[PDB]
């Protein structure tokens, strides 16, 4: 009663062939389905019977194996194949799902659009003041965002978010959110994020001066 997908992650480029495996600890036989789950959506059945393919699912998803070692192949990665993939046994309970396998499409570098937002007067009436810096459509996913109030480089008081890679063009968007209380924000003037990214020849600093 146990199934091991391998590997955990994999970033492939478009056109590539991508192989995920799934190792059953008992003898599932033909009794294995493969599931695709796109970001923030339910899962979809791609493959069942280890090797049959659900209607309208593209020929490019193809799985195989029998009994104990199984293997899903995506013969030509498209941009919409960035999902997470799961295997599952269904001979008899427990109908166990595999550990998962996240797959990220790998495009050329793309620098990010950068915006910045001082705190609403709406929010200052409520005591706290958060500044939001936006990173709009980029790859690769990593980027160093650095806050600086009066050039004093802030630490420990900002939190990032990041969207899933786009199914169309495989780009991320990030938001860092600096969070001060009206009293801290009201002392300083020079408020800035500055963004380093691989797609950037030199760092960017969008900034504003009020507070």
């Amino acid at each position: 009663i146990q199934m091991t997908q391998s590997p955990s992650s994999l970033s492939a480029s478009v056109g590539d062939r991508v192989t995920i495996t799934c190792r059953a600890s008992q003898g599932i036989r033909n009794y294995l389905a493969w599931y695709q789950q796109k970001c923030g959506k339910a899962p979809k059945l791609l493959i069942y019977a280890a090797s049959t393919l659900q209607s309208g699912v593209p020929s490019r998803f193809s799985g195989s194996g029998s009994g104990t070692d199984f293997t899903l192949t995506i013969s030509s990665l498209q941009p919409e194949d960035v999902a997470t993939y799961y295997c599952q046994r269904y001979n008899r309970a427990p109908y166990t799902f595999g550990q998962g396998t996240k797959v990220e499409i790998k495009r050329t570098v793309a620098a990010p659009s950068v915006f910045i937002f001082p705190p609403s007067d709406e929010q200052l009436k409520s005591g706290t003041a958060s500044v939001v810096c936006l990173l709009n459509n980029f790859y690769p996913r990593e980027a160093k965002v650095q806050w600086k109030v009066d050039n004093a480089l802030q630490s420990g008081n900002s939190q990032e978010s990041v969207t899933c890679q786009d199914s169309k063009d495989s780009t991320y968007s990030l938001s860092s959110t600096l969070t001060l209380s009206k009293a801290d924000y009201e002392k300083h003037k020079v408020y800035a994020c500055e963004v380093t990214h691989q797609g950037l020849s030199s760092p960017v600093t969008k900034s504003f001066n009020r507070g």
Binding site: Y31, A33, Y35, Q37, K41, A42, P43, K44, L45, Y48, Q54, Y86, Q88, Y90, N91, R92, A93, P94, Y95, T96, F97, G98, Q99, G100, S113, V114, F115, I116, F117, P118, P119, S120, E122, Q123, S126, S130, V132, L134, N136, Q159, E160, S161, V162, T163, S173, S175, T177, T179, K206, F208
Partner: protein
Amino acid sequence: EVQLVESGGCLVQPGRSLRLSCAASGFTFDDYAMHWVRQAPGKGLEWVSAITWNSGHIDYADSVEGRFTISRDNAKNSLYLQMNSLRAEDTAVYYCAKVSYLSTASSLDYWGQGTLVTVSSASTKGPSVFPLAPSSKGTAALGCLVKDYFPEPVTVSWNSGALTSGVHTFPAVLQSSGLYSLSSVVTVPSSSLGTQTYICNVNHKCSNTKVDKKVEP
């Protein structure tokens, strides 16, 4: 067009017990085994429970034995999961799923969209919505800030859903306070900025609140 709608679960206290429902339609309910599969926020799928069409056999996972109970009311085309002794770590999205064929040794070919259950003693709070108005910083960007609410989730649409191109609604991120915070932003043609009205519609189901902020330069 087969569809499975889950409901019932929002916020629930540890030790206590909540009951998830899954009315189904668009196929003969009497025929297919049903499952419950759950996904822990930021974790894999996990198989919870299973039941034959005539409620005549049943299985649970070890994670679940002794606390949950699957059940089904074929007459009211509906599938239940009584969840007792809820632990903090039961917090997950809970899906029901029809079986491919007239057999239990069969895959899951339609999934509901799944209700989020959160297990916590903390109390529910609707969110403060704040405007991220467009200033200096060809195109320009504006958005909303959905601050300090609990539990997950909120839904943000723009201009009642008519606006969709170029919208980022970020994953909520939990704060020191223990409340979630959120940003939803759009890229817009700046040309329109003085003529076009942009409104974000936030809607926090678990606190009955719903707000419609209008963003202005």
